[PDB]
Structure formats: structure tokens, C-alpha cells
Amino acid sequence: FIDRGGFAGTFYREEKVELESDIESFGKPDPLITKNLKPGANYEKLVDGFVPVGTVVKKGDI
Amino acid sequence: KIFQNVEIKPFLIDFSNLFIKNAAKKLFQLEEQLPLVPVNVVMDFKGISRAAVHGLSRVLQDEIPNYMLDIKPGGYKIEDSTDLFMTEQFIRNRINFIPIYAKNETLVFALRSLNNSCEVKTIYSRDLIQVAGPKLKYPIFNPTFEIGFLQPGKSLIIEDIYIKKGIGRKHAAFNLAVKTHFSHLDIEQYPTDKKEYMALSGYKQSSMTSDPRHHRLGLCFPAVPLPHINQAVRTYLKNACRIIIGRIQSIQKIYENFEEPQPELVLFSMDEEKTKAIITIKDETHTIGNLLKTYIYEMIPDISFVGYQCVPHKQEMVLTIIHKASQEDLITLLEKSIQNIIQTFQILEKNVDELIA
Amino acid sequence: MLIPVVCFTCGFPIGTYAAIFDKARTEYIKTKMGGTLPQNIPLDASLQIELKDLITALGIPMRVCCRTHLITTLDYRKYY
Amino acid sequence: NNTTNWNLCKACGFKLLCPHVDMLIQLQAAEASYDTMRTKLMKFSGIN
Numbered sequence: 323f324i325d326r327g328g329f330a331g332t333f334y335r336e337e338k339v340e341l342e343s344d345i346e347s348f349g350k351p352d353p354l355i356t357k358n359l360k361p362g363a364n365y366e367k368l369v370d371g372f373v374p375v376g377t378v379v380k381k382g383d384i
Numbered sequence: 385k386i387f388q389n390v391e392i393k394p395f396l397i398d399f400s401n402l403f404i405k406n407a408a409k410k411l412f413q414l415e416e417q418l419p420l421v422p423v424n425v426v427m428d429f430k431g432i433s434r435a436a437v438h439g440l441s442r443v444l445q446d447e448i449p450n451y452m453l454d455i456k457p458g459g460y461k462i463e464d465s466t467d468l469f470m471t472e473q474f475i476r477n478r479i480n481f482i483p484i485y486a487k488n489e490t491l492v493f494a495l496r497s498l499n500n501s502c503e504v505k506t507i508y509s510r511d512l513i514q515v516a517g518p519k520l521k522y523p524i525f526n527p528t529f530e531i532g533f534l535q536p537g538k539s540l541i542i543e544d545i546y547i548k549k550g551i552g553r554k555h556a557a558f559n560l561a562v563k564t565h566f567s568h569l570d571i572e573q574y575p576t577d578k579k580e581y582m583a584l585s586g587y588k589q590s591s592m593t594s595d596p597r598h599h600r601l602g603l604c605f606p607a608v609p610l611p612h613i614n615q616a617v618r619t620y621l622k623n624a625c626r627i628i629i630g631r632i633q634s635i636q637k638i639y640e641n642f643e644e645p646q647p648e649l650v651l652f653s654m655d656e657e658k659t660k661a662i663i664t665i666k667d668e669t670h671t672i673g674n675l676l677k678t679y680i681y682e683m684i685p686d687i688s689f690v691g692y693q694c695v696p697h698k699q700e701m702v703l704t705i706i707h708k709a710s711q712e713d714l715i716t717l718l719e720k721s722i723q724n725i726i727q728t729f730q731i732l733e734k735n736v737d738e739l740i741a
Numbered sequence: 742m743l744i745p746v747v748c749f750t751c752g753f754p755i756g757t758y759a760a761i762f763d764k765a766r767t768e769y770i771k772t773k774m775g776g777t778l779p780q781n782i783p784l785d786a787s788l789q790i791e792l793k794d795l796i797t798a799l800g801i802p803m804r805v806c807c808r809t810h811l812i813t814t815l816d817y818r819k820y821y
Numbered sequence: 822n823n824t825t826n827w828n829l830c831k832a833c834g835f836k837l838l839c840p841h842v843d844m845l846i847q848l849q850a851a852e853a854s855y856d857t858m859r860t861k862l863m864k865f866s867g868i869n
């Protein structure tokens with residue numbers, strides 16, 4: 323009954339991030355310039371500052 | 385002759401009903417039977433334990449290999465699928481549970497639906513175009529399924545729809561047979577219409593005491609071609625037999641290696657000349673354990689103990705056998721019981737081949 | 742959002758007779774509706790709409806679960 | 822033994838002292854704050 327779709331659906335969450343006017347920006351950081359990057363992170367999935375739609379993001383991914 | 389008196393009956397659409405006739409004829413231009421129909425098969429077994437019949441039923445339900453239609457990762461084309469309601473999860477759940485009767489694992493389909501109209505357009509299963517593999521001389525699924533629906537001006541493009549193999553226990557989309565009947569023909573029954581007996585099961589013997597050996601089992605298969613029903617059902621039955629034998633033969637490779645230290649077999653020598661054998665097998669169900677317990681109990685009427693405990697949260701079957709013989713004699717009796725199981729299912733194979741013409 | 746392809750309980754192929762069962766049912770209701778607004782059908786207090794023979798003619802067996810899910814499943818196209 | 826491998830003891834032959842330990846000791850004796858110590862020991866960062 324579970325596998326056939328009984329009480330099955332999709333659950334949604336949202337991420338709303340804001341900027342500081344002309345200080346901050348959206349983009350992929352680089353290791354050799356930016357400071358105190360989060361340990362055990364994954365910055366390679368970013369495309370122009372945002373992860374592309376349709377990819378699977380897991381724990382530790384930026 | 386363990387298995388006799390089998391009868392097979394398909395599930396067909398009654399076109400004498402005007403409503404169904406008109407609806408089918410104006411929806412799918414359908415005036416005769418669908419290529420694939422469900423088939424109800426009723427089987428009578430005599431001189432066989434209910435453990436074996438129930439194990440055969442369980443294997444035919446969700447322990448036999450079976451084929452479904454699945455979408456490869458990246459098949460759902462986000463670049464082209466503009467529909468906001470037909471999500472990948474919903475559509476792939478719809479596709480996985482379409483009953484198919486496939487010939488090989490090479491067929492690859494595709495679903496390309498474009499909605500150029502101003503009304504919601506329903507995507508049926510007849511819109512699945514075979515794009516890879518040999519061309520089909522007969523459909524493998526019915527064209528009357530409702531895969532989805534598109535809002536006006538939307539689209540749904542899915543590629544790499546392949547055939548995936550698995551057992552029904554792991555995922556329900558591989559389930560094969562749906563139960564329709566199970567009864568014991570050698571036990572009398574009360575008339576349960578009376579208010580005196582409606583609180584009881586009906587049988588005149590308690591399950592704590594009864595040992596029926598004459599059963600009727602009726603199972604329904606969801607998709608079988610019309611002109612080869614007897615060819616399909618028979619195959620299914622035969623398939624089940626091999627599976628059980630195969631699994632039993634696995635245990636037959638354990639007892640043969642009782643001299644060497646084997647993780648799945650543990651032998652103790654208890655007090656009062658008593659010996660103990662523990663067989664722990666991972667990813668086994670109540671089928672093999674129940675068969676083993678029943679046949680060991682039949683082989684050794686005066687056994688001290690036997691149990692087949694299958695634990696849900698441990699995903700394993702532990703068969704404990706305590707008997708007042710030596711280790712060698714116990715292993716000999718276990719091998720004899722396994723051989724009895726093998727010959728019983730071989731006789732089932734032969735009867736299946738003999739009955740269904 | 743539609744009638745399930747297979748019965749949620751046992752897995753009988755309900756979906757392959759789903760669409761037809763929808764459309765045909767409508768005419769049957771049109772036969773039994775009677776001087777009443779559509780949205781007031783479940784409040785008529787005089788209707789005897791029985792779908793036993795329709796499902797039987799579809800070839801679906803007399804299973805409780807299968808007919809329950811065939812009859813009672815809502816359709817998203819009909820509300821949106 | 823600037824980077825990428827252990828310092829080895831000439832007297833015996835086994836490992837002696839990892840370079841980041843040397844840099845950490847130098848910073849600790851050189852009135853280095855934690856932030857000025859966390860950022861400088863970033864060329865020794867582990868698996869990326």
C-alpha cells in the first residue's frame with residue numbers, strides 16, 4: 323500500500339536569502355581568495371551562484 | 385498426482401452493456417477485447433501440506449522475478465516538460481505500476497506529449513512510443529491506461545523508459561499474483577449465515593489441531609495475452625517452482641559444509657545426547673522457514689524442537705532444530721527433508737506441465 | 742490526481758478500465774439525475790445510483806478494495 | 822619538508838613532526854589570535 327502511493331505526496335521547503343546593497347553578491351566563491359569556507363562543504367554544485375533546478379542536494383552541499 | 389483439476393478463466397469486458405460499449409467506442413475506438421487481460425486460475429492440490437501450497441502462493445505473489453517499466457535517471461526532460469502538475473514522482477509512480485508482459489529487457493520506450501489545444505489533454509498509455517529494441521509484434525501493455533493530463537499549452541517529454549527486473553518483496557511494482565481464493569477441501573465447514581456461527585471462522589476443526597492436505601488456491605494474474613493464456617499461466621506456475629527449489633538448494637549447500645566452520649550453520653552438543661542446529665540465513669521469508677519446519681517435523685515426528693523464527697527488524701530467518709541424535713544423523717535427516725521438498729516441487733512441476741494443455 | 746493504475750490494496754489493474762468507467766458513469770448519472778442541479782446531486786435524498794452492474798460489465802471482480810478505489814477516487818481534472 | 826609529507830628523524834628514521842605542528846607552535850609563540858591562526862593554517866586543510 324505504501325509503494326503504490328497510499329498517503330504519498332511531495333513535501334516542500336523554501337530558502338529565502340537576502341543581500342546587503344552593493345556589499346554582498348551571488349556567485350561561486352574560490353578557495354584561494356575567500357575566507358573561512360564552511361568545513362566539509364560542497365561548492366562545486368553552484369552554477370552562477372545558485373544550484374541548478376533538478377539536481378539532488380544533500381547534507382553539506384552549498 | 386499432487387496437482388489436479390486446474391481451471392483458467394480470463395476477465396473480459398461485457399459489451400452487452402450500452403454504457404460501457406459507448407464509452408469504450410468513443411474513447412479508444414474499442415469494440416473487442418483488450419490485448420492483455422487478467423486471468424483467474426483456480427488450482428486443486430491433494431496429498432500436499434498447506435505449508436508448500438502457501439509457499440507457492442507467496443512466491444507467485446511477491447517472491448518471483450518480474451518486470452516493470454522504469455525511468456532512467458535523467459529521463460524526465462526538465463528542459464522540455466513544461467507541465468506544472470505532472471511531476472516526475474507522480475508520473476513515474478504511474479508508469480511503474482502498469483502491468484506488463486515483456487519478452488526481453490532491451491525494449492526502451494518514450495513519452496512525448498505536446499498540447500497544442502486549449503483544453504486539458506489526457507496522456508494515455510497508447511502514447512508510449514517504442515524507441516529502442518526489436519519492433520513489437522504484440523503489445524506488452526494495455527493502451528487504455530491514464531498516465532496523466534496536460535494543461536493547455538504544456539508538454540511532457542520522457543525518454544529512457546526501460547524494463548526493470550525485481551522481486552515483489554522489495555518493491556510492490558514487481559508483484560505478480562493477487563489472491564482470490566484459498567480454502568481447505570478436507571475440512572468441513574459450518575453454515576456461517578446462522579447467528580450462532582457467524583463469530584467463528586467456519587471450519588469444524590481448530591487450526592491448533594487441524595492438518596489439512598487437500599487445498600484449493602485461486603490466484604489472478606493482471607496481464608496475460610489473449611491467444612496464449614495457457615502458455616503464460618503455465619510458465620508462471622513453473623517459474624515459481626524453480627524459484628523455491630533454488631532457494632531450498634541454497635540451504636542444501638549449507639548442510640553439505642557442516643564439517644568446516646560455516647557462519648550460517650552452528651552445531652552444539654547438549655546434555656542427554658541432545659544436539660542443536662541453528663541455521664541463520666539473511667533476507668529469507670516465512671516461505672522457506674515454514675517449508676523447512678514442516679518437512680523436518682514430518683521427517684522426525686519425535687523431534688525435541690523446531691522453529692523458523694523470521695525477525696522483521698533483523699531481516700533474517702533463524703531455524704532452530706533440537707533432536708536427540710548425533711550431528712551426523714541430524715544432518716542426514718535434514719538432507720532427507722530437503723530432498724523431500726525438492727521432489728515434491730518437482731512433482732508439482734510435472735503436474736503443471738501435464739494439466740495445462 | 743486520477744484513478745490509480747492498480748488497486749492500492751491488492752494491485753489489480755484498475756487503471757486499464759478506469760477512464761471508461763469514468764465516462765460511462767456520467768451518462769448513467771444523467772439517466773438517474775432528474776430535474777436537479779448537478780452540484781446538488783449528493784443532497785437529493787431520493788437517488789438510487791448503483792454502479793454494481795457497470796463495474797461488473799467492465800470485467801472487474803467483486804473485490805471490496807478494487808471497487809472502493811475505482812468508485813471513490815477523486816479526479817484532479819474535474820476540480821481544477 | 823615544507824608540505825605534503827611528514828618530517829623524518831635523521832637519528833632514527835621514523836616520523837618526527839608534521840609541518841603544521843611547527844607552524845602552529847610558531848604562531849602560538851608569536852601572539853597569534855585564533856582567527857589569525859585558523860586562516861594561516863588553511864594551506865594544510867584536509868580532504869577537499
Ligand SMILES: [Zn+2]
Binds near residue numbers: 750804806
Ligand atoms: Zn483490490
Ligand SMILES: [Zn+2]
Binds near residue numbers: 830831832833834835
Ligand atoms: Zn628519532
